[PDB]
Ligand binder design. Structure first.
Ligand code: CLA
Ligand code: CLA
Ligand code: CLA
Ligand code: CLA
Ligand code: CLA
Ligand code: CLA
Ligand code: CLA
Ligand SMILES: CC1=C(C#C/C(C)=C/C=C/C(C)=C/C=C/C=C(C)/C=C/C=C(C)/C=C/[C@@]23O[C@]2(C)C[C@@H](O)CC3(C)C)C(C)(C)C[C@H](O)C1
Ligand SMILES: CC1=C(C#C/C(C)=C/C=C/C(C)=C/C=C/C=C(C)/C=C/C=C(C)/C=C/[C@@]23O[C@]2(C)C[C@@H](O)CC3(C)C)C(C)(C)C[C@H](O)C1
Ligand SMILES: CC1=C(/C=C/C(C)=C/C=C/C(C)=C/C=C/C=C(C)/C=C/C=C(C)/C=C/C2=C(C)CCCC2(C)C)C(C)(C)CCC1
Ligand SMILES: CC1=C(C/C=C(\C)CCC[C@H](C)CCC[C@H](C)CCCC(C)C)C(=O)c2ccccc2C1=O
Ligand code: SF4
Ligand code: SF4
Lengths: 107, 30, 731, 80, 31, 178, 148, 91
């Protein structure tokens, strides 16, 4: 499955640069990026992010520009939702670009 | 070419080391 | 007497988490029930003894296996063609096809082809026959036997060392510098001069005749007369063949530099001189500190006085002696940071300056060693930072460090964290943006629009070191400069040729791809440091949890109140930064492996062209070089790389299973285990068989640990296969 | 069992006790507070650690504070 | 000799670790 | 306040005259660090006696096979009279016999060596302890001191003979050219 | 002994029951050496030093490795594995009014020194086995040729 | 050295270090420190120049006296810091 389907048929995606399917190549990479970006939200937790925002808020307050709407790390449910959304978008876009580039090139 | 007696002698020293390892583990466990 | 005897709380714990947490806090000796400092130190000492014995047993096992089942003698005759054998395979699951495929290396039985370089190491060091390897294994076995007995002995009542002796810093540092580093390096230089240079020059020096054979024809008369240049006179010729007397010199201590032409490794005379000199330095430096004879230094006095004028660094280094000598976690963190930096240094230096004969042409071993040592360096760095955090949350005393150089770190931790965030953000934004610009430009059929920054500063360093293809003509590149002239009769006549020879990995040519990937490496290092430094500095407290030190180092959370407090403990900072350690080391190893595959294959204009965009990495490195691995076994048959393919998929599977513990958390699994408990208790027949520990879902920190474990093991398995099999299949 | 503590920044607003789902907390008379009452934890062995007291505490930082510790059947909240 | 892989690998990687797992389980389920 | 052996260095704090052969000889203070650690000099004294007694036996054996006949020579006739080469020429049978005997004897010794029993007099293994039944306390201490002196001398004697045989191949007034 | 209460409980270790069982096994083993020696003298075992094949004994054959596993070896292997199967059956299964391998809770190990005749013969048989193995090792000769 | 047996060398509240930091040279005057530092700088720079700048170093030309005198240049730095410390402490 890894060799004769993914590796074998990824050729038409990866070799698409400089051709009309180069948009599919770019979206392949971008969907990969978003799928990986999702793992930040999926694995991490609000406490670290709120403390990091506290450090950044100190940096802003030192310059007299900390906003009236105080910044907070995303809620726990929201972090899970954002991770899930990015994970689904990245995976689905990866498959989308892969299938479209492969099938348009060969068929 | 390593000989059978050589392998057996090394194995005997390894067994002595094993006994000492059990002893050290005991003494660290107490 | 229940399993966690060291922790009565887990002893009363009735669920299955008792076993997990007992195994997990087995070695957390500081927090055990009824523990004293003296007992802690003695137990640590005995465990160190056992650990050393393990190391030497591992070494003896490698030596014995190469002696017994390896083709060391055949490999010695033809190092560049015969493939080194690690050990024989004993597997009843092997078929006839796998048997025939794994039967290789000029032996009649299945074997594993060594990729650790131990063959090259021992051949360079002076081993020529299986008997020498077997005797080395025997002696290391005896050494481990003695170390185990020493560990047992140093827990006895009359032989239990005291806390004052343990905290005697000056004597320990004096002895480690002078003897553990210094005299041991002197011993290695003596070994080289007595056994390795003669064996390279075609002389069989062993225990029976090393006492009779003179390493130099003159003897020690030059050493005593002070005419030490006679030991450099008559160096090895450029036509020398390793292991033979033809073209062999008589010099034992030289500074020729460069590389040995036949083996493409540094001269053994150079290495012996290195170890001799370096030992002089270390044996001198080991007389720095005061130990029972008045003359010397006082580390507490040094730290106390080093406070700059007008209180620039607050109170200076006052109290740092007390904190370091009282807290073992700070010592552990310093040791781990130093050792991680050293591991990165050896990884960067072994490939650029090979020291073992014929290792440079062994492409699989070089990649395996670089990846191995870079990964261990990353782990050591993460551990150093984690133990710094544990020190801050457990052992830090602000009363002792009032207005200290260490307390000021906590004072402006907000500035530090914010600026690390800034630099990480800048690096990532710009590196990713330039990579995407290059991606889109090459994608749209116009690579000319790529933004390609020449790494002019690194190229300038290469020119100053001796490179000449850039044409900068600065320092050593300019033959005329003081730097080039002052060293023109010691090392430059060889180093210049070595660096400008294009057949070497010494100071590889660099380009825009190297610029971009180096900025990516900077992003990885900076973000890992951000996560780790933030964890260390916020371990004591935060605006969201000022009393974090009361909870300690590793606790699940503070609850959903105050908006949620997930991963707030500063252990979760380590667990987060581990992902970034893996990420940055993966980037480093991909860069190394692709650039070196291209250089070895002779098409550097594949890396220089494709590495500027990310699809080049995805295609000309991963996809292109994944064929010999994934074709290890297919529908038509199998090759000797089928083990690498199976382990590749194995690491993929473990990496994937880690996502389960990282994403799905305890409540789902707890309720599901309630359902399973109901089913087991209610079904007939099976309900006679009943557990003793109540089965519960894994704790939160436990599951974070398990998920990260599955991630890391996975990472290493996947790249090990891909780095060991693609290189073999491509060369 | 977990350790529940109450600090003298209590204002006697009696919300931790209402958030309590195990009857661990209870108001007792006190001279310090204006309301004349302070939360106290005489049944810490029944604590499970859900920290609803901490969530419901309105002080700038928590007057009622819970430290997780030795686990038990009650603390794990196992019906078996 | 070539005897010893057959004698030692299964003894050391089926029998001994199974006995160790049995011993560890029995020990941790004491008292 | 000052050592008796070296009358310009301080007396070792660990040594206090309550041991056989205590003449305050410890420039390094190995005993000092041992007692600071928490141990007691029983182990070092027993090691001294063991090393010494071995050294006396080995001193006589170094020169016996040359000065006097190397046994009736059923099997020893092949082995050289040089002690440094005789070690690398013992047959497997004899080597195993001697090694097994020594190993069993010292495995028996180890348990009493590393025991907590305070009754154990240092270097008192019971081998031929019947001649001290009639000795007085002064006689016992003096005889133990002669033993320790012989031990201390033989230890240096082996180093001298071994290095002389290795570098020169001959002991000067006694055995020559071997 | 005392430091190993777990194995001391069921007679596992330096115990009279263990010595009895090992003496019985040494008796049967000396019998077995004599029996297989006369078997090799006669014709029962396959001859020719024919190596096993993957088609008959699979990966346990080690057809192409080395180590010349023979059909006589396979047959005696089957015999000793059947001995080990009956062993597990007799040890773990019901003690057919004989001897338990384990001490059992109630029993205490017999006092250290017809049953005594068995133990004397067992000590003699263990000594004979060790002497034969040594004599083979020193001489370099085969065990069957040594006993012959 | 232990925690107890260690001199009070902290000087963050004062303008100059105590002279005790100089250890064995806690009493040698600032004049001696400065003169020795200057001679050490001159001699060491002379040795370094004669070894690697005026001449080209090599296996047959490395000079032990010049090598040893090179180590008087850092000693010169230490001696000049010492001269300042003793001048400020009044010795
Ligand atoms: C840690 C070092 C090490 C390693 C990784 C291995 C690995 C291996 N050995 Mg072993 N071996 C070693 C040291 C080691 N050996 C040493 C020093 C000797 C004595 C000279 C032997 C002698 C030996 C023989 C004779 C044989 C093997 C074989 C094997 C293979 C099967 C496993 C087996 O049963 O061996 C273990 C066998 C033993 C007799 C036990 C050796 C005891 C070692 C020294 C323990 C070291 C422990 C370690 C440091 C830490 C603890 C590990 C664990 C508890 C967590 C395998 C490749 C077999 C083979 O070739 O298969 C193809 C085989 O026939 N080995
Ligand atoms: C000269 C005397 C001496 C020597 C040789 C040692 C040696 C050692 N001590 Mg030390 N120690 C000494 C005096 C000495 N000690 C004294 C006087 C004290 C009391 C004041 C102590 C107190 C002490 C403690 C409390 C402990 C040690 C420990 C150790 C071990 C450190 C771990 C190790 O092996 O790292 C090996 C390190 C090296 C070989 C140095 C080189 C490292 C570089 C980076 C490697 C270079 C790589 C190279 C290219 C590889 C090529 C392949 C080591 C065996 C620890 C231990 O393990 O105890 C069992 C320990 O816990 N010592
Ligand atoms: C850094 C020190 C060092 C190291 C790592 C080695 C390593 C080696 N030497 Mg040795 N050697 C050394 C110093 C060292 N030597 C010195 C100073 C000399 C005197 C000139 C020699 C002279 C020498 C000879 C003549 C020979 C070796 C050989 C060897 C090999 C086998 C060693 C063995 O079996 O040890 C087993 C013993 C132990 C593990 C115990 C070591 C000592 C303990 C740890 C005490 C430490 C204090 C190995 C490559 C043999 C070989 O074949 O080389 C190619 C060989 O014949 N060495
Ligand atoms: C010199 C090295 C060194 C030493 C002496 C210590 C010592 C310690 N560390 Mg550790 N640590 C190190 C390196 C070191 N560390 C490194 C490199 C890291 C970075 C990864 C860490 C990160 C770290 C953290 C984050 C923490 C510690 C903690 C501790 C303490 C308790 C650990 C414990 O209970 O272990 C016993 C642990 C176990 C029995 C679990 C071992 C699981 C292994 C690693 C699994 C291996 C994978 C798998 C099974 C193999 C797959 C094979 C194939 C399929 C102890 C004082 C803890 C502490 O102090 O808490 C207060 C703590 O929280 N350390
Ligand atoms: C590809 C995956 C990925 C990406 C892109 C990031 C990105 C980031 N991580 Mg990391 N992170 C990851 C995986 C990833 N992480 C994983 C798996 C984990 C383990 C849980 C973590 C854990 C983690 C922690 C705990 C921390 C970070 C931090 C950071 C920052 C690092 C500096 C940087 O690059 O800033 C520059 C940012 C980028 C290169 C990407 C930004 C978005 C691009 C440029 C698009 C721009 C907007 C676009 C036009 C919108 C269109 C909408 C329609 C950044 C937010 C640290 C941080 O926040 O430092 C400030 C930090 O503390 N990460
Ligand atoms: C190779 C032949 C052989 C055979 C068939 C046996 C068989 C037996 N031995 Mg073993 N034993 C052997 C060689 C052998 N021994 C040798 C060479 C020694 C001397 C080191 C011992 C020393 C020994 C002891 C000390 C004990 C056994 C015990 C046993 C019994 C249980 C062992 C067990 O559970 O193993 C694991 C599966 C079993 C009847 C035990 C016994 O009888 O327990 C009641 C017991 O205590 N044996
Ligand atoms: C640049 C800023 C700076 C300012 C100071 C200030 C001070 N330092 Mg120094 N120090 C500095 C940097 C600085 N240090 C650095 C970077 C280090 C790390 C190496 C040190 C290490 C250090 C130590 C270890 C000590 C001081 C001490 C002192 C105090 C006395 C200085 C003096 O008079 O020395 C006088 C110096 C001399 C008279 C000459 C000796 C100096 C040379 C350089 C020695 C060279 C030895 C030689 C090369 C050895 C062989 C090399 C190799 C092969 C091993 C003073 C508070 C001393 C003190 O007691 O503080 C409490 C003290 O013990 N410092
Ligand atoms: C190095 C050198 C030289 C030298 C030298 C020197 C000074 C060497 C000195 C050697 C020395 C001083 C050697 C002591 C031996 C003691 C013995 C044999 C005691 C045995 C005692 C035994 C075997 C006792 C047995 C017992 O069972 C008996 C019989 C009775 C029982 O109740 C129990 C005991 C146990 C008591 C030369 C040669 C001068 C030349 C040149 O200068 C270079
Ligand atoms: C040194 C010393 C001590 C001592 C002592 C002494 C004198 C110890 C002597 C120990 C001794 C002499 C121990 C032999 C055991 C032999 C056994 C168990 C062999 C069984 C072998 C068996 C069961 C083999 C059987 C078979 O293979 C055979 C043969 C044929 C094959 O078809 C298959 C079978 C399985 C059927 C102490 C007391 C220990 C401590 C003290 O401080 C000092
Ligand atoms: C948190 C914490 C901690 C930790 C920490 C860490 C972990 C760190 C690390 C760190 C690191 C990891 C660092 C590094 C560094 C480095 C450096 C600083 C370098 C330098 C260099 C140089 C100076 C060089 C120079 C040169 C030469 C000499 C030659 C050639 C040229 C050049 C120029 C390059 C501790 C424990 C402390 C405690 C407290 C807290
Ligand atoms: C990265 C991250 C953050 C920090 C990320 C935040 C706050 C998102 C930032 C979104 C703003 C609106 C920026 C969007 C781009 C423009 C600059 C506006 C969390 O707050 C968090 C909380 C809980 C679980 C996981 C995480 C998590 O993974
Ligand atoms: S501060 Fe918390 S504990 Fe105090 S009265 Fe209010 S809710 Fe109750
Ligand atoms: S920690 Fe949980 S059980 Fe305890 S008082 Fe708060 S809500 Fe109730």
């Amino acid at each position: 499955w890894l060799r004769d389907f993914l590796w074998s048929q990824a050729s038409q995606v990866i070799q698409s640069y400089g051709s009309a399917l180069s948009a599919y190549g770019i979206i392949f990479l971008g969907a990969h990026f978003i799928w990986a970006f999702s793992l930040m939200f999926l694995f991490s937790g609000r406490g670290y992010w709120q403390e990091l925002i506290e450090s950044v808020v100190w940096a802003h307050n030192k310059l007299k520009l900390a906003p009236a709407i105080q910044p907070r790390a995303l809620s726990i449910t929201q972090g899970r939702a954002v991770g899930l959304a990015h994970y689904l978008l990245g995976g689905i876009g990866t498959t989308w670009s892969f299938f479209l580039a492969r099938i348009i090139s060969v068929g | 070419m390593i000989t059978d007696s050589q392998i057996f002698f090394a194995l005997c020293i390894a067994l002595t080391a094993a006994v000492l390892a059990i002893g050290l583990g005991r003494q660290l466990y107490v | 007497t229940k399993f966690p005897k060291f922790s009565q709380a887990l002893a009363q714990d009735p669920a299955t988490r008792r076993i997990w947490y007992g195994i997990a806090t087995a070695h957390d000796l500081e927090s055990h029930d009824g523990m004293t400092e003296e007992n802690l130190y003695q137990k640590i000492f005995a465990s160190h003894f056992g650990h050393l014995a393990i190391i030497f047993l591992w070494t003896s096992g490698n030596l014995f296996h190469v002696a017994w089942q390896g083709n060391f003698q055949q490999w010695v005759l033809n190092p560049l063609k015969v493939k080194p054998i690690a050990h024989a395979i004993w597997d009843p699951h092997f078929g006839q096809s796998a048997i025939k495929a794994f039967t290789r290396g000029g032996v009649s039985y299945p074997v594993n082809i060594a990729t650790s370089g131990v063959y090259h190491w021992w051949y360079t060091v002076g081993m020529r026959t299986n008997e020498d390897l077997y005797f080395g294994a025997l002696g290391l076995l005896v050494l481990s036997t003695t170390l185990l007995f020493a560990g047992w002995l140093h827990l006895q009542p009359k032989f239990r060392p005291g806390i004052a002796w343990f905290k005697n810093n000056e004597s320990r540092l004096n002895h480690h510098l002078s003897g553990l580093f210094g005299v041991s390096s002197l011993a290695w230089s003596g070994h080289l001069i007595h056994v390795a240079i003669p064996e390279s020059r075609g002389q069989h020096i062993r225990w029976n005749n090393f006492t009779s054979t003179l390493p130099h024809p003159e003897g020690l008369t030059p050493f005593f007369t002070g005419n030490w240049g006679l030991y450099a006179e008559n160096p090895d010729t450029a036509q020398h063949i390793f292991g033979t007397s033809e073209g062999a010199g008589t010099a034992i201590l030289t500074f020729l530099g460069g590389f040995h032409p036949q083996t493409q490794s540094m001269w053994l005379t150079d290495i012996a001189h290195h170890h001799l000199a370096i030992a002089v330095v270390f044996i001198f430096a080991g007389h720095m500190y005061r130990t029972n004879w008045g003359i010397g230094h006082s580390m507490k006095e040094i730290l106390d006085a080093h406070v700059p004028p007008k209180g620039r660094l607050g109170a200076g280094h006052r109290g740092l002696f007390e904190t370091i000598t009282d807290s073992l976690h700070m010592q552990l963190g310093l040791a781990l940071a130093s050792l991680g930096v050293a591991t990165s240094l050896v990884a960067q230096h072994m490939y650029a300056l090979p020291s073992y004969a014929f290792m440079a042409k062994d492409y699989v071993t070089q990649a395996a060693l670089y990846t191995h040592h870079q990964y261990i360096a990353g782990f050591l760095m993460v551990g150093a930072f984690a133990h710094g955090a544990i020190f801050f949350v457990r052992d830090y005393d602000p009363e002792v460090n009032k207005d200290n150089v260490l307390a000021r770190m906590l004072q402006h931790k907000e500035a530090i964290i914010s600026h690390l965030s800034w630099v990480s953000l800048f690096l990532g934004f710009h590196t990713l943006g330039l990579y995407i610009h290059n991606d889109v430009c090459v994608a749209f059929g116009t690579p000319e629009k790529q933004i390609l920054f020449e790494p002019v500063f690194a190229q300038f360093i290469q020119a100053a070191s001796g490179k000449a293809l850039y044409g900068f003509d600065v320092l050593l590149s300019s033959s005329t400069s003081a730097a080039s002239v002052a060293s023109s009769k010691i090392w430059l006549p060889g180093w210049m040729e070595a660096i400008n020879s294009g057949k070497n990995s010494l100071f590889l040519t660099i380009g825009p791809g190297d610029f971009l990937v180096h900025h990516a490496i900077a992003l990885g290092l900076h973000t890992t440091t951000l996560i780790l430094v933030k964890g260390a500095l916020d371990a004591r407290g935060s605006k969201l949890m000022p009393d974090k030190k009361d909870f300690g180092y590793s606790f699940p959370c503070d609850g959903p109140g105050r908006g949620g407090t997930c991963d707030i403990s500063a252990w979760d900072a380590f667990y987060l930064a581990m992902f970034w350690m893996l990420n940055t080391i993966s980037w480093v190893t991909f860069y190394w492996h692709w650039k070196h595959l291209t250089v070895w294959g002779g098409n550097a204009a594949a890396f220089n062209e494709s590495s500027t965009y990310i699809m080049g990495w995805l295609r000309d490195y991963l996809w292109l070089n994944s064929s010999p691995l994934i074709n290890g076994y297919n529908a038509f048959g199998m090759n000797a790389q089928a083990v690498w393919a199976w382990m590749f998929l194995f690491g993929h599977l473990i990496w994937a299973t880690g996502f389960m513990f990282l994403i799905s958390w305890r409540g789902y699994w707890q309720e599901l285990i309630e359902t399973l408990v109901w089913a087991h208790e209610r079904t007939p027949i099976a309900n006679l068989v009943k557990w003793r520990d109540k089965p519960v879902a894994l704790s939160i920190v436990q599951a974070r640990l398990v998920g990260l474990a599955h991630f890391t093991v996975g990472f290493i398995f996947t790249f090990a296969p891909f780095v060991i099999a693609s290189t073999t299949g491509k060369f | 069992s977990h350790s529940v503590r109450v600090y003298d920044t209590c204002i006697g607003c009696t919300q931790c006790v209402r958030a309590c789902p195990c009857d661990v907390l209870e108001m007792v008379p006190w001279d310090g507070c204006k309301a004349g009452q302070i939360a106290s934890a005489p049944r810490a062995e029944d604590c499970i650690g859900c920290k609803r007291c901490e969530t419901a505490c309105p002080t700038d930082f928590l007057s009622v504070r819970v430290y997780l510790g030795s686990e038990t059947t009650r603390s794990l909240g196992l019906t078996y | 000799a070539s005897f010893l892989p057959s004698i030692l690998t299964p003894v050391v990687t089926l029998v001994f670790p199974g006995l160790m797992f049995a011993l560890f389980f029995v020990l941790i389920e004491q008292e | 306040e000052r050592s008796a052996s070296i009358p310009f260095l301080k007396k070792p704090p660990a040594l206090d005259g309550s041991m056989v052969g205590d003449v305050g000889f410890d420039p390094l203070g190995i005993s000092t660090t041992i007692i600071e650690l928490g141990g007691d000099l029983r182990y070092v004294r027993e090691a001294e006696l063991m090393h010494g007694r071995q050294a006396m036996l080995a001193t006589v054996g170094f020169v016996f096979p040359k000065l006097f006949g190397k046994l009736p020579a059923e099997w020893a006739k092949d082995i050289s009279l040089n002690p440094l080469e005789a070690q690398y020429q013992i047959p497997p049978v004899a080597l195993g016999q001697i090694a097994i005997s020594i190993a069993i004897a010292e495995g028996l010794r180890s348990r009493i060596v590393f025991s907590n029993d305070p009754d154990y007099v240092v270097g008192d293994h019971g081998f031929g302890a019947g001649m001290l039944k009639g000795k007085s306390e002064a006689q016992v201490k003096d005889m133990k001191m002669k033993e320790l002196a012989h031990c201390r001398l033989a230890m240096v004697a082996i180093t001298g003979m071994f290095f002389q045989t290795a570098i020169t191949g001959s002991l000067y007034p006694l055995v020559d050219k071997f | 002994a005392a430091d190993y209460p777990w194995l001391a409980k069921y007679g596992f270790g330096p115990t009279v029951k263990a010595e009895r069982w090992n003496g019985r096994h040494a008796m049967f083993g000396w019998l077995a050496i004599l029996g297989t020696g006369v078997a090799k003298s006669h014709g029962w075992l396959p001859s020719g030093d024919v190596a096993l094949t993957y088609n008959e004994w699979g990966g346990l054959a080690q057809q192409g490795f080395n180590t010349y596993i023979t059909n006589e070896r396979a047959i005696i292997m089957i015999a000793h594995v059947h001995a080990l199967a009956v062993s597990a059956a007799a040890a773990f299964g019901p003690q057919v009014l004989g001897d338990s391998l384990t001490l059992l809770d109630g029993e205490k190990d017999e006092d250290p020194y017809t049953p005594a005749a068995e133990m004397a013969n067992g000590r003699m048989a263990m000594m004979g086995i060790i002497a034969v193995v040594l004599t083979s090792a020193i001489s370099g000769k085969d065990i069957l040729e040594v006993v012959d | 050295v232990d925690r107890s047996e260690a001199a009070d060398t902290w000087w963050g509240d004062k303008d100059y270090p105590p002279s005790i930091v100089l250890g064995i040279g806690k009493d040698v005057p600032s004049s001696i420190f400065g003169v020795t530092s200057g001679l050490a700088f001159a001699i060491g720079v002379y040795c370094v120049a004669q070894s690697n700048l005026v001449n080209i170093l090599s296996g047959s030309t490395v000079n032990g006296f010049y090598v040893a005198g090179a180590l008087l240049v850092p000693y010169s730095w230490g001696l000049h810091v010492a001269a300042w410390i003793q001048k400020q402490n009044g010795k």
